[PDB]
Each structure stands twice: as structure tokens, then as C-alpha cells.
Design an enzyme around this catalytic site. Structure first.
Site, PDB file in Angstrom:
ATOM      1  N   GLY A   2     114.181 -41.537  49.835  1.00  0.00           N
ATOM      2  CA  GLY A   2     114.254 -41.337  48.397  1.00  0.00           C
ATOM      3  C   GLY A   2     115.624 -41.536  47.778  1.00  0.00           C
ATOM      4  N   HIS A  29     133.545 -43.534  42.278  1.00  0.00           N
ATOM      5  CA  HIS A  29     133.560 -42.113  41.878  1.00  0.00           C
ATOM      6  C   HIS A  29     134.311 -41.182  42.812  1.00  0.00           C
ATOM      7  CE1 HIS A  29     130.690 -43.024  38.804  1.00  0.00           C
ATOM      8  NE2 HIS A  29     129.707 -43.356  39.653  1.00  0.00           N
ATOM      9  N   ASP A  69     135.860 -52.535  35.321  1.00  0.00           N
ATOM     10  CA  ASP A  69     134.668 -51.968  35.958  1.00  0.00           C
ATOM     11  C   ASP A  69     133.442 -52.188  35.080  1.00  0.00           C
ATOM     12  OD1 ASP A  69     132.735 -49.934  36.779  1.00  0.00           O
ATOM     13  OD2 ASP A  69     134.357 -48.729  37.683  1.00  0.00           O
ATOM     14  N   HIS A  75     127.946 -46.941  35.231  1.00  0.00           N
ATOM     15  CA  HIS A  75     128.576 -45.629  35.224  1.00  0.00           C
ATOM     16  C   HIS A  75     130.088 -45.753  35.052  1.00  0.00           C
ATOM     17  CE1 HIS A  75     124.858 -45.197  37.602  1.00  0.00           C
ATOM     18  NE2 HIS A  75     124.728 -44.015  36.969  1.00  0.00           N
ATOM     19  N   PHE A 109     144.911 -43.073  38.619  1.00  0.00           N
ATOM     20  CA  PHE A 109     146.038 -43.744  37.959  1.00  0.00           C
ATOM     21  C   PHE A 109     146.243 -43.327  36.487  1.00  0.00           C
ATOM     22  CE2 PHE A 109     144.362 -46.676  41.272  1.00  0.00           C
ATOM     23  CZ  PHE A 109     145.449 -46.599  42.110  1.00  0.00           C
ATOM     24  N   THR A 133     149.967 -43.247  35.180  1.00  0.00           N
ATOM     25  CA  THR A 133     150.887 -44.338  35.454  1.00  0.00           C
ATOM     26  C   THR A 133     150.557 -45.568  34.619  1.00  0.00           C
ATOM     27  OG1 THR A 133     151.874 -45.756  37.157  1.00  0.00           O
ATOM     28  CG2 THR A 133     149.578 -45.178  37.478  1.00  0.00           C
ATOM     29  N   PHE A 183     133.542 -50.328  31.125  1.00  0.00           N
ATOM     30  CA  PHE A 183     132.468 -50.562  30.146  1.00  0.00           C
ATOM     31  C   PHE A 183     131.304 -49.809  30.757  1.00  0.00           C
ATOM     32  CE2 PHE A 183     134.643 -53.959  27.900  1.00  0.00           C
ATOM     33  CZ  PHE A 183     135.506 -54.442  28.852  1.00  0.00           C
ATOM     34  N   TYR A 185     147.072 -46.842  28.862  1.00  0.00           N
ATOM     35  CA  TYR A 185     146.763 -47.650  30.049  1.00  0.00           C
ATOM     36  C   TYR A 185     145.389 -47.344  30.652  1.00  0.00           C
ATOM     37  CZ  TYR A 185     151.485 -49.293  29.519  1.00  0.00           C
ATOM     38  OH  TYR A 185     152.628 -49.894  29.032  1.00  0.00           O
ATOM     39  N   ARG A 192     116.789 -49.341  38.725  1.00  0.00           N
ATOM     40  CA  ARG A 192     116.122 -48.050  38.888  1.00  0.00           C
ATOM     41  C   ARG A 192     116.831 -46.881  38.189  1.00  0.00           C
ATOM     42  NH1 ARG A 192     115.138 -45.124  44.821  1.00  0.00           N
ATOM     43  NH2 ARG A 192     114.802 -42.990  44.038  1.00  0.00           N
TER      44      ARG A 192
HETATM   45  C1  LIG Z   1     127.987 -46.625  43.445  1.00  0.00           C
HETATM   46  C2  LIG Z   1     128.574 -46.324  42.077  1.00  0.00           C
HETATM   47  C3  LIG Z   1     127.565 -45.764  41.078  1.00  0.00           C
HETATM   48  O1  LIG Z   1     126.494 -46.647  40.822  1.00  0.00           O
HETATM   49  O2  LIG Z   1     128.316 -45.546  39.899  1.00  0.00           O
HETATM   50  C4  LIG Z   1     126.975 -44.447  41.602  1.00  0.00           C
HETATM   51  C5  LIG Z   1     126.032 -43.719  40.641  1.00  0.00           C
HETATM   52  C6  LIG Z   1     125.911 -42.221  40.977  1.00  0.00           C
HETATM   53  C7  LIG Z   1     124.912 -41.452  40.135  1.00  0.00           C
HETATM   54  C8  LIG Z   1     124.933 -39.950  40.397  1.00  0.00           C
HETATM   55  C9  LIG Z   1     123.935 -39.169  39.536  1.00  0.00           C
HETATM   56  N1  LIG Z   1     124.060 -37.738  39.777  1.00  0.00           N
HETATM   57  C10 LIG Z   1     123.643 -36.833  38.884  1.00  0.00           C
HETATM   58  O3  LIG Z   1     123.173 -37.148  37.794  1.00  0.00           O
HETATM   59  C11 LIG Z   1     123.769 -35.386  39.311  1.00  0.00           C
HETATM   60  C12 LIG Z   1     123.457 -34.313  38.267  1.00  0.00           C
HETATM   61  C13 LIG Z   1     122.533 -34.522  39.408  1.00  0.00           C
HETATM   62  C14 LIG Z   1     122.543 -33.537  40.582  1.00  0.00           C
HETATM   63  C15 LIG Z   1     121.931 -34.124  41.843  1.00  0.00           C
HETATM   64  N2  LIG Z   1     120.538 -34.617  41.580  1.00  0.00           N
HETATM   65  C16 LIG Z   1     119.918 -35.129  42.850  1.00  0.00           C
HETATM   66  C17 LIG Z   1     118.475 -34.708  43.028  1.00  0.00           C
HETATM   67  C18 LIG Z   1     117.932 -35.078  44.397  1.00  0.00           C
HETATM   68  C19 LIG Z   1     116.530 -34.562  44.691  1.00  0.00           C
HETATM   69  C20 LIG Z   1     115.800 -35.304  45.819  1.00  0.00           C
HETATM   70  C21 LIG Z   1     116.603 -35.385  47.111  1.00  0.00           C
HETATM   71  C22 LIG Z   1     116.391 -36.615  47.997  1.00  0.00           C
HETATM   72  C23 LIG Z   1     116.152 -37.945  47.287  1.00  0.00           C
HETATM   73  N3  LIG Z   1     117.178 -38.286  46.287  1.00  0.00           N
HETATM   74  C24 LIG Z   1     118.516 -38.113  46.556  1.00  0.00           C
HETATM   75  C25 LIG Z   1     119.459 -38.346  45.649  1.00  0.00           C
HETATM   76  C26 LIG Z   1     119.089 -38.802  44.343  1.00  0.00           C
HETATM   77  C27 LIG Z   1     120.039 -39.047  43.346  1.00  0.00           C
HETATM   78  C28 LIG Z   1     119.650 -39.514  42.093  1.00  0.00           C
HETATM   79  C29 LIG Z   1     118.305 -39.748  41.840  1.00  0.00           C
HETATM   80  C30 LIG Z   1     117.353 -39.495  42.805  1.00  0.00           C
HETATM   81  C31 LIG Z   1     117.730 -39.016  44.057  1.00  0.00           C
HETATM   82  C32 LIG Z   1     116.695 -38.749  45.066  1.00  0.00           C
HETATM   83  O4  LIG Z   1     115.502 -38.919  44.873  1.00  0.00           O
HETATM   84  C33 LIG Z   1     120.656 -39.736  41.043  1.00  0.00           C
HETATM   85  C34 LIG Z   1     120.598 -40.456  39.875  1.00  0.00           C
HETATM   86  N4  LIG Z   1     121.766 -40.332  39.160  1.00  0.00           N
HETATM   87  C35 LIG Z   1     122.528 -39.545  39.896  1.00  0.00           C
HETATM   88  N5  LIG Z   1     121.898 -39.162  41.039  1.00  0.00           N
HETATM   89  C36 LIG Z   1     120.505 -35.642  40.483  1.00  0.00           C
HETATM   90  C37 LIG Z   1     121.125 -35.088  39.203  1.00  0.00           C
HETATM   91 CA   LIG Z   2     146.383 -45.935  34.035  1.00  0.00          CA
HETATM   92 CA   LIG Z   3     131.989 -48.972  34.253  1.00  0.00          CA
HETATM   93 ZN   LIG Z   4     126.655 -47.113  38.856  1.00  0.00          ZN
END
Ligand SMILES: CCC(O)(O)CCCCC[C@@H]1NC(=O)[C@H]2CC23CCN(CCCCCCCC[n+]2ccc4cc(ccc4c2O)-c2cnc1[nH]2)CC3
Ligand SMILES: [Ca+2]
Ligand SMILES: [Ca+2]
Ligand SMILES: [Zn+2]
EC number: 3.5.1.98
Length: 368
Positions: free
Chosen positions: A21, A135, A168, A172, A181, A184, A192, A216, A264
Site C-alpha cells: 500500500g 524532504h 524543484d 510537493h 540553505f 546562505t 513550484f 535566495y 496517485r
Molecule cells: C519523493 C518526494 C515527494 O514526492 O515529495 C514525497 C511526497 C511525500 C508525501 C507525504 C504525505 N504525508 C502526509 O500527508 C502525512 C500527514 C500524513 C500522516 C501519515 N499518513 C499515512 C497513513 C498510512 C496508512 C496506511 C499504512 C500503509 C500503507 N500506506 C503507507 C503510507 C502512505 C502514505 C500516503 C498515502 C497512503 C499511504 C498508505 O496507504 C501519503 C500521501 N501523502 C503523504 N503520505 C498520511 C497522512
Molecule cells: Ca538559500
Molecule cells: Ca516543488
Molecule cells: Zn512529491
């Protein structure tokens, strides 16, 4: 003209599994690699296997205690680390999985190795689709990221470059890189992203840096449904003004594919051509460039996106008809490289886009 491109990939990367999941799927890195191999893009790049970055390389940014924890925790011993797991934000979003540390070492190794190759002037572009984990914080995992390969790669570039520009385009906010940074002027961070009832909650257009870093940090907050036309309308003008005022000598571009239509977790409406137009814009400035991955949770679209962005880096035209590949069935029912936008409403009106762009231009006028 056409540039030398070095690409970093470890064949084991696709085997790391965050759990049932969990939206983060390292297998999308292997799908991207297989697709670009079947398009013949391997005959035009230098392909390298990154080394496993050491705990010592990671502590150039992260705390010793946090890296020691990452190197020690495993699913079989998690019960003994309940205290440290809370302290370091290891849980549902950033779970403990088999080979977690090795996954961080490979993601990081590609970004740092790419930065070293750029510093030695041995390549024009370095690509690491397993990196871009923006992150991660000094002593905390966040948003599926444990080790901030981007910050480590930027610290490497800073050994030979006075000013580094970080851009970026993940949906997110690039909070970990911005925070590292924030005080600095040697790094300008430009993100964005979707802003409003969305993770991580940071990246307001009023967050512009502090102390020597004031002006900056640049943030362009967006609403749901941004499309190619709207994104394109602001990206080139903002990046051109940043290039003009900041005059960076190296650039790092995080190409998170969660800003594509049908993601997704994302709520934007870009196509692969719209997303890749950002790579074309940056590549046009002819500066040493490190291209990294990031988000992207509809894995067939992440593979299309990063395969097309590797072709863009190489100035290689590739057909829309997908070549046969190990994951061909994932690209049905059309089996084409390019994607169509959805009918979702673009909440970013043309006036809102122009107004935010003008606010950012006012801040850019404040640079020396
Ligand atoms: C690589 C760079 C990047 O693209 O910027 C990375 C993007 C990071 C996004 C992070 C974001 N966290 C939150 O918004 C946190 C506030 C939150 C607290 C934690 N719950 C997780 C609930 C998990 C329940 C089920 C456990 C197993 C399955 N599983 C795991 C993790 C999941 C995460 C997300 C969606 C389903 C899960 C699932 O279904 C999920 C969606 N958005 C988040 N987590 C969610 C809510
Ligand atoms: Ca800076
Ligand atoms: Ca961004
Ligand atoms: Zn992302």
C-alpha cells in the site's frame, strides 16, 4: 550544442520495497531504465553504477546519531528502537523496510557521484533518477525521504561553484533543501508546488529566506489542475530572471513526476511534454546540470516522463510508439509514450499566475 550525459543506476534499486500500500515504488526506477534501454538511449550516454555512499559522506549534512540509527534499524529489531523511531519520524510515511540503509546509500551515491563528475568537468549533465529525495532533514526522515541526496550533492558542487541554483518541479514543496540553505546566498532554491491543505504545509510565497539568505529562496504556490499552457507561461520567465540576477555556475533540477496528470497523490494536470519543457528551459542555459528524480506515484507515467526527459538531455528524438520492453503491459491500453491531460478544472487562473509571477519578480529585483 549536444552534451555529454552521464547516467547513474544500480540494477538492485528496483528491489527495495516500502511495503504493501505504500505509494513510493522504487520499481519505477527499473521501469524507467528498461524503457530507456529499449528506446536505444544507452548508445548515447555514459552509464555508471553509483557507489554505496558511506555514513561519513551522509554526515556532511545529517547528524551522526540519525545516520547511525538508519544504519542500525531493521524490521527484525524495530521493537528495540521505538524511542528513536519517534525522534527521527520513522513510521507510516517513512517506514522501516529490508535494505533501507542500502537504498539510501544508492540514492545518495548517484547524486554525489554525479556532482563529483560535474565538478571535474567530465560531463555536462549527470542524471540520477533514484535521487531527488527533497524532504529529508538533518536529523529526521520526512515524506518518504530519509537521506537528503540533493543537499549532499549541492554541498559537493559548492566545493567548486560559488553559486548553485536548485529548481524543484515536484508537486510537493522542496522543504528539506530550502531549510538546509535558508540562511546562505551560495544556493538559491526555487520550488513550484501545490500549496494549501497539502504536504508538507510549507512553501508560502512569503517564505523568501533569512539573514544572508534573504531573497535566495523562491516559492511559487499553486492550486489544483495546473496545465502545460499555464506552467509554461511562468516557468521560463521566472527561471530566465533567476539566471539573469543570480548567475549560478551549476544547477540541480529535481524532476518529481507527481506533478503529471493522473498521479496517485498529485492534483496537477501536466503532460510529459509539459513537464519536460522545464528540462528544455534549464538545459538551454548551458550550465553544468544535475537532473534528479523525486515523487511520481502512477509508475507507468513516471517511466514515460523520465525516459522522455533523458531523451531531452541527449537531444534525441524518440518515437511516440513505445518499444517492446519488460513492463510493456503496464503501458496499456495505448502503449504510447505521451499522455493526455484530463478534463480537471485549472484553479490557477491566468490572473493568479501573473500576479504570483509579478510578486516573485519584485523579490528578484532585491538581489545585488
Ligand atoms: C519523493 C518526494 C515527494 O514526492 O515529495 C514525497 C511526497 C511525500 C508525501 C507525504 C504525505 N504525508 C502526509 O500527508 C502525512 C500527514 C500524513 C500522516 C501519515 N499518513 C499515512 C497513513 C498510512 C496508512 C496506511 C499504512 C500503509 C500503507 N500506506 C503507507 C503510507 C502512505 C502514505 C500516503 C498515502 C497512503 C499511504 C498508505 O496507504 C501519503 C500521501 N501523502 C503523504 N503520505 C498520511 C497522512
Ligand atoms: Ca538559500
Ligand atoms: Ca516543488
Ligand atoms: Zn512529491
Amino acid at each position: 550544442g549536444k552534451k555529454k550525459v552521464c547516467y547513474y543506476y544500480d540494477g538492485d534499486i528496483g528491489n527495495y520495497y516500502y511495503g504493501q500500500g505504500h505509494p513510493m515504488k522504487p520499481h519505477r526506477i527499473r521501469m524507467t531504465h528498461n524503457l530507456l534501454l529499449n528506446y536505444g538511449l544507452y548508445r548515447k550516454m555514459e552509464i555508471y553504477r553509483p557507489h554505496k555512499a558511506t555514513a561519513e559522506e551522509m554526515t556532511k549534512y545529517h547528524s551522526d546519531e540519525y545516520i547511525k540509527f538508519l544504519r542500525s534499524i531493521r524490521p527484525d529489531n524495530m521493537s528495540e528502537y521505538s524511542k528513536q523511531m519517534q525522534r527521527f519520524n520513522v513510521g507510516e510515511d517513512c517506514p522501516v523496510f529490508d535494505g533501507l540503509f542500502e537504498f539510501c546509500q544508492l540514492s545518495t551515491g548517484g547524486s554525489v557521484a554525479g556532482a563529483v563528475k560535474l565538478n571535474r568537468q567530465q560531463t555536462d549533465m549527470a542524471v540520477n533518477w533514484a535521487g531527488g529525495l527533497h524532504h529529508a532533514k538533518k536529523s529526521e526522515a520526512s515524506g518518504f525521504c530519509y537521506v537528503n541526496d540533493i543537499v549532499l550533492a549541492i554541498l559537493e558542487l559548492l566545493k567548486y561553484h560559488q553559486r548553485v541554483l536548485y529548481i524543484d518541479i515536484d508537486i510537493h514543496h522542496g522543504d528539506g533543501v530550502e531549510e538546509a540553505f535558508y540562511t546562505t546566498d551560495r544556493v538559491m532554491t526555487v520550488s513550484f508546488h501545490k500549496y494549501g491543505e497539502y504536504f508538507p504545509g510549507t512553501g508560502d510565497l512569503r517564505d523568501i529566506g533569512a539573514g544572508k539568505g534573504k531573497y535566495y529562496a523562491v516559492n511559487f504556490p499553486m492550486r489544483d489542475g495546473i496545465d502545460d499552457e499555464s506552467y509554461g507561461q511562468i516557468f521560463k520567465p521566472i527561471i530566465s530572471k533567476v539566471m539573469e540576477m543570480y548567475q549560478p555556475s551549476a544547477v540541480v533540477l529535481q524532476c518529481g513526476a507527481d506533478s503529471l496528470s493522473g498521479d496517485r497523490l498529485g492534483c496537477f494536470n501536466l503532460t510529459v511534454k509539459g513537464h519536460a519543457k522545464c528540462v528544455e528551459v534549464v538545459k538551454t542555459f548551458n550550465l553544468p546540470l544535475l537532473m534528479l528524480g523525486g515523487g511520481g506515484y502512477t509508475i507507468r507515467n513516471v517511466a514515460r516522463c523520465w525516459t522522455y526527459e533523458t531523451a531531452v538531455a541527449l537531444d534525441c528524438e524518440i518515437p511516440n510508439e513505445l518499444p517492446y520492453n519488460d513492463y510493456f503491459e503496464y503501458f496499456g491500453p495505448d502503449f504510447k509514450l505521451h499522455i493526455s491531460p484530463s478534463n480537471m478544472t485549472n484553479q490557477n487562473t491566468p490572473e493568479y499566475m501573473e500576479k504570483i509571477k509579478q510578486r516573485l519578480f519584485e523579490n528578484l529585483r532585491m538581489l545585488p
